[PDB]
Amino acid sequence: MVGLIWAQATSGVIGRGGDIPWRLPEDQAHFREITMGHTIVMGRRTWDSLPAKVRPLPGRRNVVLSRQADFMASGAEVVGSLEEALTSPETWVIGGGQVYALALPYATRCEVTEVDIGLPREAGDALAPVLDETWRGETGEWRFSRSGLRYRLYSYHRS
Ligand SMILES: NC(=O)C1=CN([C@@H]2O[C@H](COP(=O)(O)OP(=O)(O)OC[C@H]3O[C@@H](n4cnc5c(N)ncnc54)[C@H](OP(=O)(O)O)[C@@H]3O)[C@@H](O)[C@H]2O)C=CC1
Ligand SMILES: CCc1nc(N)nc(N)c1C#C[C@H](C)c1cc(OC)cc(-c2ccc(C(=O)O)cc2)c1
């Protein structure tokens, strides 16, 4: 089972300028709940965006995709191909834009957080993948953050 997990603005934006363009603690707990104890796979750019205190993400086997055979990352398994990255029975792909696109055909689950923020797409943004009709989805009820942000969770499956 390969799953994708991401948080997006309604527009589809998941990243801009190498960061996630909002703060949503409740989403972080959700992310932790889904991924804990499992292998997580991420692109090198997403690995870089992790704060040092949380790099590698603890309690998870961190796998980082890079075409750089040189690339070093303490606490992470650096691999040069997707095949090398998806060798765990339950694998969660945690970003970013490039790697969601690469892993999407391998995926049978998506766990999506939608953030109700005004954030129209700009050229060069990292974007969420588009889920087509092969997917079946359940839409969660809207929640309000601490904070000021409305958000909701989707669970998507295909067999
Ligand atoms: N909102 C969310 O849920 C999330 C948001 N983000 C955001 O996403 C953005 C980063 O995503 P993105 O810019 O798309 O970059 P990625 O995080 O997807 O990493 C891209 C890198 O992955 C490596 N790579 C890509 N394809 C391959 C391949 N086929 N084989 C081997 N290595 C490969 C390369 O690393 P190299 O260049 O070293 O070869 C490439 O530069 C940031 O803004 C981040 O904050 C990230 C995760 C989740
Ligand atoms: C929490 C954000 C997030 N939400 C969802 N639903 N899917 C995702 N794939 C990511 C993501 C991501 C990137 C890798 C990221 C960036 C970041 O910048 C501060 C922090 C985290 C992060 C995730 C979990 C934990 C934790 O378990 O304590 C800490 C930091 C994770």
Swiss-Prot record:
Question: Can you tell which superkingdom this protein's organism belongs to?
Answer: Bacteria
Could you give a single Gene Ontology term from the biological process aspect?
folic acid metabolic process
What the record says about activity regulation is: Inhibited by isoniazid metabolites. The prodrug isoniazid is metabolized to isoniazid-NADP adducts that inhibit the enzyme at subnanomolar concentration.
Q: Name one Pfam family in it.
A: DHFR_1
What Gene Ontology terms describe what this protein does at the molecular function level? dihydrofolate reductase activity; NADP binding; NADP+ binding
Taken from the UniProt entry, a GO cellular component term is: cytosol
DHFR domain sequence ranges: 1-158
Q: List positions binding substrate.
A: I5, W6, A7, D27, R32, R60, Y100, T113
Which Enzyme Commission number(s) are on file for it?
1.5.1.3
Reaction catalysis annotation: (6S)-5,6,7,8-tetrahydrofolate + NADP(+) = 7,8-dihydrofolate + NADPH + H(+)
UniProt entry tagged with the keyword Transferase: no
InterPro entries, from UniProt? Answer: DHFR, DHFR-like_dom_sf, DHFR_CS, DHFR_dom
The positions annotated for binding NADP(+) are 6-7, 14-19, 43-46, 65-68, 80, 94-99
| Recorded metabolic or biological pathway in which this protein acts | Cofactor biosynthesis; tetrahydrofolate biosynthesis; 5,6,7,8-tetrahydrofolate from 7,8-dihydrofolate: step 1/1
For this UniProt record, the keywords arranged alphabetically read as follows:
NADP, One-carbon metabolism, Oxidoreductase
Query: According to its UniProt record, which protein family does this protein belong to?
Result: Belongs to the dihydrofolate reductase family.
Q: What does this protein do?
A: Key enzyme in folate metabolism. Catalyzes an essential reaction for de novo glycine and purine synthesis, and for DNA precursor synthesis.
Protein known as: Dihydrofolate reductase
Species for this entry: Mycobacterium tuberculosis (strain ATCC 25618 / H37Rv)
The gene designation is: folA
